[PDB]
């Protein structure tokens with residue numbers, strides 16, 4: 222009976238960088254034309270949400286963050302055709318408008334309506350649906366899932382299987398799809414190849430999953446936190462290396478281990494130095510390196526372009542290269558059919574009210590994904 | 596007869612950086628096992644030979660440069676099976692040993708036996724076949740074509756059609772193949788696409804030829820020398836732009852002209868700034884940029900990795916990505932079958948004795964390719 226009415230609910234508001242989230246009452250406006258209001262069920266903590274806190278990823282504050290989630294449609298605005306009240310949905314932090322040059326391209330997925338390249342922290346219409354203490358609060362990536370209710374544009378939501386377990390499939394909204402697609406869609410890992418994966422968090426584990434699914438013969442995990450190695454091996458890594466253990470730079474180590482460079486390398490951390498190291502460790506004539514980590518705002522890397530002239534390919538991608546609204550329902554259907562596993566990514570579960578504890582777990586190195594339940 | 600004997604002949608020796616070539620008598624040793632001695636017939640002047648003079652491209656001096664050439668086998672060493680005396684041949688500045696990981700890979704062409712990565716300026720066996728005034732002279736890229744006779748390793752020569760016109764097909768030894776392959780093999784330009792080509796010298800014109808052959812709908816030539824535009828249009832450019840004409844950076848101009856970025860861009864100059872500009876002007880989600888120009892020794896570029904994270908692909912290649920010994924004979928057969936033209940690249944034909952005049956034409960902006968005839 223909330224349709225057409227403002228909803229008062231709890232959200233996690235970030236008022237300032239480098240401070241805890243504030244769990245407090247917000248007002249959530251009803252959906253306008255082509256908007257959908259969603260009752261959240263579960264949301265994951267992705268490192269990119271932490272990047273908002275640390276100022277690594279700049280977006281306007283104050284803000285409701287969160288972008289990896291699943292929920293149930295509470296109401297729809299005028300003209301919505303793709304979801305209905307009561308449908309299970311995943312918000313799409315990369316929209317799929319279906320009309321722009323990228324959406325029409327066979328490969329492209331970074332729809333021109335995204336709010337990632339130059340964040341404004343609004344709905345598509347340039348306004349906000351959120352008020353707190355009487356003040357407007359920004360959106361994040363058109364999703365804002367750290368709230369009991371959010372409002373998203375229709376191009377930023379996908380209907381998923383009615384029988385889906387939302388406390389698992391929320392990871393299809395970011396970390397799993399990003400890493401898995403980086404391997405299977407962006408790099409196009411080949412059977413029998415050697416892969417190196419830098420960073421063994423939720424996204425990097427999902428890259429390993431995808432390299433293993435593509436038939437790689439060797440998958441070398443790289444992390445400075447050796448506590449990450451056991452789970453990386455469980456999901457497919459054949460060996461793991463800690464750069465801190467070596468006197469030589471790890472690109473040299475990896476080149477030696479792979480008898481002249483790897484076929485595919487993945488940067489899944491977000492550091493400029495490891496982006497260049499990961500490029501360098503792929504074979505100089507035919508290697509491919511994929512950047513998935515999010516770099517610190519406005520900072521440039523330095524590299525020798527002879528790394529490319531010999532024949533290397535360097536690319537990056539958002540959301541694993543997947544066209545979001547076409548792919549998310551299919552990934553959920555494949556999960557339901559047991560084509561991949563999400564449980565290896567989930568190390569902790571907490572109620573939404575303990576969001577700050579969830580971020581502490583990420584920052585301490587202890588968690589992969591913590592799932593928050595509303 | 597000359598077989599088995601030292602040949603005294605004329606060559607252009609580079610004794611020091613930034614000096615004219617010295618045209619004088621050298622001694623050319625007979626070929627050892629698996630080596631081939633070639634009587635040169637024609638050699639082109641490529642900007643990479645000038646980079647040796649300018650110190651842009653470091654290789655041991657003193658040196659006999661030259662790498663884009665065609666000639667006739669004078670004699671073969673023990674064990675040679677792929678050419679015989681009297682055969683027309685093109686020396687291969689990128690070898691094809693057929694045994695290394697790169698040669699065995701379907702895509703790779705930068706054979707591990709190359710002398711480009713870490714130049715030693717010798718034969719494969721670590722010695723030189725050249726002396727001048729009693730001093731040993733270095734080889735260049737396993738070819739050294741600025742000489743009436745040279746000696747190359749068997750993996751660095753290809754037999755070509757006995758009826759081929761050597762004064763034209765010498766360009767298949769570098770400039771034509773490099774540019775054409777950058778388009779058709781490395782970028783894999785698609786029908787209907789928009790391409791931008793930075794640098795309208797012999798290599799860049801060959802990139803335009805490839806883009807046109809691949810069916811590009813728009814091919815935008817970019818050069819600071821407007822005298823290069825007429826020939827670019829003759830070989831397929833649909834429009835040309837001079838960055839000096841605009842108040843805004845050319846990547847902005849090209850993004851606007853292409854309604855949001857080009858499909859394929861090509862850096863065919865060798866400047867760090869234009870490498871980054873070329874990357875930036877390709878469409879951010881699905882654009883591809885290829886580096887063909889040779890960068891100045893030991894210098895790094897600076898770039899924001901968000902250019903890649905959005906979805907761009909950045910790659911480079913040597914020799915157009917062609918496996919050299921397999922491809923050169925087929926390219927010559929294709930030329931003989933009128934599948935592409937070489938005449939548009941040739942602006943000047945001079946006797947070998949005028950090599951310095953040929954370099955002056957290149958440096959002054961007045962030539963595309965000068966062919967030197969022996």
Ligand SMILES: NC(=O)c1c[n+]([C@@H]2O[C@H](COP(=O)([O-])OP(=O)([O-])OC[C@H]3O[C@@H](n4cnc5c(N)[nH+]cnc54)[C@H](O)[C@@H]3O)[C@@H](O)[C@H]2O)ccc1-n1cccn1
Nearest residue numbers: 268269420422423424444445446490491513514515539540
């Ligand atoms: N491209 C996308 O769409 C995208 C990008 N991100 C970004 O991916 C990176 C990884 O995210 P994560 O897996 O959620 O993060 P962590 O759990 O923190 O794992 C990182 C991993 O790296 C190790 N590490 C740190 N420093 C080093 C060094 N020097 N060497 C080796 N390993 C190192 C840690 O120990 C840890 O285990 C992040 O940058 C993230 O921002 C994620 C998801 C999506 N995206 C885009 C927008 C929203 N989400």
Ligand SMILES: NC(=O)c1c[n+]([C@@H]2O[C@H](COP(=O)([O-])OP(=O)([O-])OC[C@H]3O[C@@H](n4cnc5c(N)[nH+]cnc54)[C@H](O)[C@@H]3O)[C@@H](O)[C@H]2O)ccc1-n1cccn1
Nearest residue numbers: 642643794795796797798818819820864865888889913914
């Ligand atoms: N990758 C290979 O295998 C390769 C590489 N090279 C390199 O390609 C570049 C172009 O060579 P070229 O066509 O022989 O050179 P030029 O005739 O001098 O044409 C350059 C073109 O650029 C224009 N220009 C200069 N500066 C600018 C700026 N700032 N903006 C725009 N245009 C600009 C000039 O006016 C001129 O028209 C070289 O770097 C070359 O080294 C060639 C061949 C092969 N290779 C590798 C090893 C041996 N050969």
Ligand SMILES: [Zn+2]
Nearest residue numbers: 318321324332
């Ligand atoms: Zn779109």
Ligand SMILES: [Zn+2]
Nearest residue numbers: 267269395396
């Ligand atoms: Zn994320």
Ligand SMILES: [Zn+2]
Nearest residue numbers: 692695698706
């Ligand atoms: Zn080889």
Ligand SMILES: [Zn+2]
Nearest residue numbers: 641643769770
């Ligand atoms: Zn050349």
